[PDB]
Design a protein around this ligand. Structure first.
Ligand SMILES: C[C@@H]1COCCN1c1cc(N2CCOC[C@@H]2C)nc2[nH]c(-c3cc[nH]n3)nc12
Lengths: 986, 263
């Protein structure tokens, strides 16, 4: 299993400088040896075989070079240490002992599976033990995606392998927004190119003014078989995109900063490219029926018994099993309960009869059941509390309907969940067999009952306009994915399902009108989506949420993404695309294959693909799914696996270091903790691990050597760590020479990670619509259970730090930005207030104050610690009001108006309001995108984002059920009531 | 009558209907205003779903389809309370049989003066926060206990695998030993037989120590396994009480806003 802690031994966070180690020689002798914690195995093996001569049977010991060490790791795995250059403290040993053995088996295959197990956080050999056929089938059949990826990766010379390691970070369209094109003069952009001299690596500045349309090769030819690069990081212009389309240049345009680029010979880059060689594993080496429609009968399931439930008899009266047939989130028929049995005797053997025709069960039909406690002590109202839940796929991954008896281990109820069933939950049995077990029995049809083929489907399918009517169809498609859909409108779409092909965007609403309880309508719908014109990616994603489980539906969605999803947007929406993998019924589906294919063909994608999956390997509901996906990715991601392990080992030592500060040394003063921390960070093992590796926040950033002076334990509760590095890039003076990150161990940063993703998406919508609401969405990444990284914005201070008067905030900006640069700082502070003021209101971010808000010398506004969002305060205090979290105070209004009194009556505040109205409407125009993004996060596990009724909060802050004229009047009313007058309409 | 029937709930939201219809038997219905005037929406329970049937309005006549026959919403609800919806649309073969009445809204009111209601609302709001803090506190011990149990279980997995290694060491020593202790028995090397025996005692001792470390960890596991079950019980007891406590608080709050001046 995964590691309990991150210490060097079980129950110990740090080995002493010297420690005793029991060495089991191959002759049965046991030799106790004292080793330095930082000692390497090749050394220990030497001293051990020097000491062995002092013991009996020393004659039959072979040469020391003929042996290696093995031991039990903290993961209960018996690991062979083929890399004798590793330190004793870096072995993750359970106890301090080493066995001496002669290596056997495929040495190379063992070394890879150990490297893969390290990145996964779990021994790969555990997957070999899985008897579940679907698991092994996934491990073998997924390899074809791997091979096809590694083939395309090396289809050409180094160039192809280069596009994989350093893909072009380009926008999704080269069209330049009108407000971005204005920054260019006569459609030209001045750029400076530096070239390291062949002798002595000197810098050759070569300022030049060139068109933004010109391809990198065109600017290269200027110079008055080569590649360009950004000074400070590792992103390369390896494709013939318009220079404006590349993100670095496009940002520099709006930011007014002059692009600084470095020219390379393209031979030093091609030579560093390794050989991404993929090798087939061991599980790939070694390895009457009746249709469902023929079965004529009703659905029934016998709930046999359960083992136990944890509830005192003195409080709860009775218990029962609540079951229900579900197709996604909606029931295919009324839920069927069993009889109420006492808590101490979980027995029913009651065949539950469901009102559904067996032949009409859709492909994605599932059974959702749970053991509920009934407590009818408080009047006519009897409270029902869920105790444990569990879900099953009526059809396994092989189209085979279930039959016979079955045992199922149930899961605990997720915090905050109040429903009696959890259909959004993952299917399958709980691996923790120390949990309640529910015995079921599906009837058996004297043969393997299977689902009819696509051919039979189309056979049963073929067996079966006013302009104002055309307008009603058009408006239904424009509505958001969460607007009410009356029955009259369901039949309206179903009756015109063939005309809908002209308006492809209506397909989501159309699928909601389908009577999935009817084989007749289902079959016909399969034929419409088969030949349905592809829809836009942002709309296809809606098909992947918990509402659209049918495979054919999801398959169509996948083919839209494969065809029209850019590598930019895929990286933009990767969080949700990873989350939706939990909703899939089976391990092997088209979605997972598409994502894995993209992860193996783009390293900027695979990096975050890896960390998103790794960050939830602690979650036993998806650990097996993500474990098998990670195994397949690492087995084929090539040489980047070496760099990922460098990242994993660095995080493991930061987790261990912070674990000691908040456990063993929690009651010692900060003067003592810093003494301990600096003393530990100076050891060889700690410097070799935390120096020279890629930044998980951005693999383009190289984290070099530590700046221990800038490192410091923050004087806070969670005891976070602020770390500083050196940027090893030769041109480190351009981008940055210090890369600072905050390592947090204790606070769940998932909600904060999602909030920063939506803010980026919001800023993207604004820039495309000529609205430079300059937002600073710094990087945030969750890498484990309440462990994550956050990018440290340099030169920022909290509004409370600035005040240590109403004009205090404005006089501070007058300094550090005095003179001709004054109008720039004000313009940034205002443009950031607009984006933040609109983004916080739309989402419902936790209240802001002088501590959550920060200002940079730049005048840039930086909100921090968002935390809650949506209707999180409605459960605490039953208030049905939409809150204005970020209320511009007098201090903030003085800054926007350049210090003018009567701040509400200034041209600057007029333009400020314009940005808010334009940004609020802009987002309101894209409300379909944001409602789908949250919809794809319902099975994530965030307490403030569980049911579609939690997402309805943003349906109100955007006034979606009102007209665009009424919504802007609602926003004004909300802002005017929270700011105490001032917001006017022009 | 008009706006006096029990099934008319005025300006309730879809969420208020879903909760009022959650786990309700087919036929349970209620009517509310148009979410998007004076348009109306009948909400009906059928097959575990909540179906929305819009009530159209044109020149004093009401109805679901274009031929608006009924002259009042009360006449429409009462008619289909005795006639099946299948006549309108065969897909919906059910009738309005279980009306959700305001009886539940006026339930729990108890007091009639704003101060008494407010004073009582303040009592409930106090008990709720005190049971939320108690619940959230109990939840962390629940999560913490669950994690440390997973750790202890993995550690015991490590103890077993380790003991197997040390036991392999014994049988390994037993195999080589005989071939040499018999050679010393004749070679008169009694002291070398003692050195082999001593190392064996050193190995059997460690095995006996490592087994006891697993025994003490298994004992701690039993203690924590039970403590987890007692926490689970206390949580499955606070959850149902905390729920209705929150609902009672919300109702008193709903009573206070309605009785008070509104915009
Ligand atoms: C990394 C971010 C942004 O860059 C500036 C530093 N930043 C932060 C500084 C900060 N404090 C500084 C003052 O002493 C206390 C505390 C340590 N606290 C935070 N909390 C978060 C956060 C993010 C999601 N959730 N919480 N980010 C920061």
């Amino acid at each position: 299993p995964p590691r309990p802690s991150s210490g060097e031994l079980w129950g110990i966070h740090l080995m002493p400088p010297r420690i005793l180690v029991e060495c089991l020689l191959p002759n049965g002798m046991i030799v106790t040896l004292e080793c330095l914690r930082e000692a390497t195995l090749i050394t220990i093996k030497h001293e051990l075989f020097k000491e062995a001569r002092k013991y009996p049977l020393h004659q039959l010991l072979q040469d020391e070079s003929s042996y290696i060490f093995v031991s039990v790791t903290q993961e209960a795995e018996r690991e062979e240490f083929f890399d004798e250059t590793r330190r004793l403290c870096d072995l993750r040993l359970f106890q301090p002992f080493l066995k001496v053995i002669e290596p056997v088996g495929n040495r190379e295959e063992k070394i890879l599976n150990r490297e893969i197990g390290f990145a996964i956080g779990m021994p790969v050999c555990e997957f070999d033990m899985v008897k579940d056929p679907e698991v092994q089938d996934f491990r073998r059949n997924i390899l074809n995606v791997c091979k096809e990826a590694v083939d395309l990766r090396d289809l050409n010379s180094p160039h192809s392998r280069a596009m994989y390691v350093y893909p072009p970070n380009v926008e999704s369209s080269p069209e330049l927004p009108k407000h971005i094109y204005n920054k260019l003069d006569k459609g030209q952009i001045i750029v400076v190119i530096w070239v390291i001299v062949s002798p002595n690596n000197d810098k050759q500045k070569y300022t030049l003014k060139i068109n933004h349309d010109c391809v990198p090769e065109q600017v290269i030819a200027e110079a008055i078989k080569y590649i360009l690069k950004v000074c400070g990081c590792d992103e390369y212009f390896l494709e013939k995109y318009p220079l404006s389309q590349y993100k670095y240049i496009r940002s520099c345009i709006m930011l007014g900063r002059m692009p600084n680029l470095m020219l390379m010979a393209k031979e030093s880059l091609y030579s560093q490219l390794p050989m991404d060689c993929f090798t087939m594993p061991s599980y790939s080496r070694r390895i009457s029926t009746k249709s469902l429609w023929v079965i004529n009968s009703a659905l029934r399931i016998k709930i046999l018994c359960a083992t136990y439930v944890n509830v005192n008899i003195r409080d709860i009266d009775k218990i029962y099993v609540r079951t229900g047939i579900y197709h996604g989130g909606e029931p295919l028929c009324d839920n069927v309960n069993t009889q109420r049995v006492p808590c101490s005797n979980p027995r029913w053997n009651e065949w539950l009869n469901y009102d559904i025709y067996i032949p009409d069960l859709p492909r994605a039909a599932r059974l959702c059941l749970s053991i509920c406690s009934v407590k009818g002590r408080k009047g006519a109202k009897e409270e029902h509390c869920p105790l444990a839940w569990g879900n099953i796929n009526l059809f396994d991954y092989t189209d085979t309907l279930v039959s016979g008896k079955m045992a199922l281990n149930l899961w605990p109820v997720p915090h905050g969940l109040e429903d009696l069933l959890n259909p959004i939950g993952v299917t399958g049995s709980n691996p923790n067999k120390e949990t309640p077990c529910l015995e079921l029995e599906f009837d058996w049809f004297s043969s393997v009952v299977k689902f009819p083929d696509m051919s039979v489907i189309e056979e049963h399918a073929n067996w079966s306009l006013r302009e104002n009517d055309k307008e009603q169809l058009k408006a239904i498609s424009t509505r958001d994915p969460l607007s009410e859909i009356t029955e009259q409108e369901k039949d309206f779409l179903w009756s015109h399902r063939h005309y809908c092909v002209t308006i492809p965007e209506i397909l989501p609403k159309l699928l909601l009108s389908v009577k999935w309880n009817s084989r007749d309508e289902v079959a016909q719908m399969y034929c419409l989506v088969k030949d349905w014109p592809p829809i836009k990616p942002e709309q296809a994603m809606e098909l992947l949420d918990c509402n659209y489980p049918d495979p054919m539906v999801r398959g169509f969605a996948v083919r839209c993404l494969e065809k029209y999803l850019t590598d930019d947007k895929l990286s933009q929406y990767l969080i949700q695309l990873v989350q939706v993998l939990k909703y899939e019924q089976y391990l092997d589906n088209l979605l997972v294959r598409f994502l894995l294919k993209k992860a193996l063909t783009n390293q900027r994608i695979g990096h975050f693909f890896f960390w998103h999956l790794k960050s939830e390997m602690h979650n036993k509901t998806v650990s097996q799914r993500f474990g098998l996906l990670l195994e397949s990715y690492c087995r084929a991601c090539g040489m980047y696996l070496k760099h990922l392990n460098r990242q994993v080992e660095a995080m493991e030592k930061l987790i261990n270091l912070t674990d000691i500060l908040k456990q063993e040394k929690k009651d010692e003063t900060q003067k003592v903790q810093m003494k301990f921390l600096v003393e530990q960070m100076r050891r060889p093992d700690f410097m070799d691990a935390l120096q020279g590796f890629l930044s998980p926040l951005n693999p383009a950033h190289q984290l070099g050597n530590l700046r221990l002076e800038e490192c410091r334990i923050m004087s806070s509760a969670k005891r976070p760590l602020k770390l500083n590095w050196e940027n090893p890039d030769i041109m480190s003076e351009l981008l940055f020479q210090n890369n600072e990150i905050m390592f947090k161990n204790g606070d769940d940063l998932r909600q904060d990670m999602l909030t920063l993703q939506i803010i980026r998406i919001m800023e993207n919508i604004w820039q495309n619509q000529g609205l430079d609401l300059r937002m600073l969405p710094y990087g945030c990444l969750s890498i484990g259970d309440c462990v994550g990284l956050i990018e440290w914005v340099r030169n920022s201070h909290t509004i409370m730090q600035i005040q240590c008067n109403s004009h205090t905030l404005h006089q501070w900006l007058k300094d550090k930005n005095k003179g001709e640069i004054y109008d720039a700082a004000i313009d940034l502070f205002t443009r950031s207030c607009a984006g933040y003021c609109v983004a916080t209101f739309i989402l419902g971010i936790g209240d802001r104050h002088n501590s959550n808000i920060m200002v940079k010398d730049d005048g840039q506004l930086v909100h921090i610690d968002f935390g809650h969002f949506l209707d999180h305060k409605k459960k605490k205090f039953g208030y049905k009001r939409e809150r204005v979290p970020f209320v511009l105070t007098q201090d903030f209004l003085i800054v926007i108006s350049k210090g003018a009194q009567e701040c509400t009556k200034t041209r600057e505040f007029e333009r400020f309001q314009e940005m808010c109205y334009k940004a609020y409407l802009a987002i309101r125009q894209h409300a379909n995108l944001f409602i789908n993004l949250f919809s794809m996060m319902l099975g994530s596990g965030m307490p403030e984002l569980q049911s579609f009724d939690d997402i309805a909060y943003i349906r109100k802050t955007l006034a979606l059920d009102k007209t665009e004229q009424e919504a802007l009047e609602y926003f004004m009313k909300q802002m005017n009531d929270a700011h105490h007058g001032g917001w006017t309409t022009k | 009558s008009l706006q006096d029937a029990e099934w008319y709930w005025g300006d309730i939201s879809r969420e208020e209907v879903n909760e009022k219809l959650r786990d309700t038997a087919d036929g349970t219905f209620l009517v509310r205003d148009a979410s998007t005037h004076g348009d109306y929406t009948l909400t009906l329970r059928k097959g575990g779903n909540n179906k929305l049937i819009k009530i159209f309005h044109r020149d004093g006549k009401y109805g679901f389809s274009d031929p608006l026959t009924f002259s009042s919403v009360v006449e429409l609800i009462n008619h289909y309370r005795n006639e099946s919806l299948a006549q309108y649309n065969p897909k919906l073969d059910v009738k309005l049989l279980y009306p959700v009445s305001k009886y539940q809204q006026d339930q729990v009111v108890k007091e009639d003066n704003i101060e008494a209601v407010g004073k009582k609302l303040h009592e409930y709001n106090t008990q709720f926060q005190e049971k939320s803090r108690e619940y959230d506190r109990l939840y962390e011990e629940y999560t913490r206990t669950s994690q440390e149990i997973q750790m202890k279980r993995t550690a015991i997995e490590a103890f077993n695998e380790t003991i197997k290694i040390f036991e392999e060491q014994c049988q390994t020593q037993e195999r080589y030993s005989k071939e040499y202790i018999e050679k010393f028995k004749r070679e008169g090397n009694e002291k070398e037989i003692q050195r082999i025996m001593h190392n064996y005692d050193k190995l059997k001792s460690r095995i006996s120590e490592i087994i006891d470390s697993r025994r003490r960890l298994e004992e701690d596991l039993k203690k924590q396994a039970a403590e987890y079950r007692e926490i689970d019980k206390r949580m499955n007891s606070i959850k149902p009480d905390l729920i209705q406590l929150r609902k009672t608080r919300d109702q008193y709050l709903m009573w206070l806003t309605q009785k008070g001046v509104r915009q």
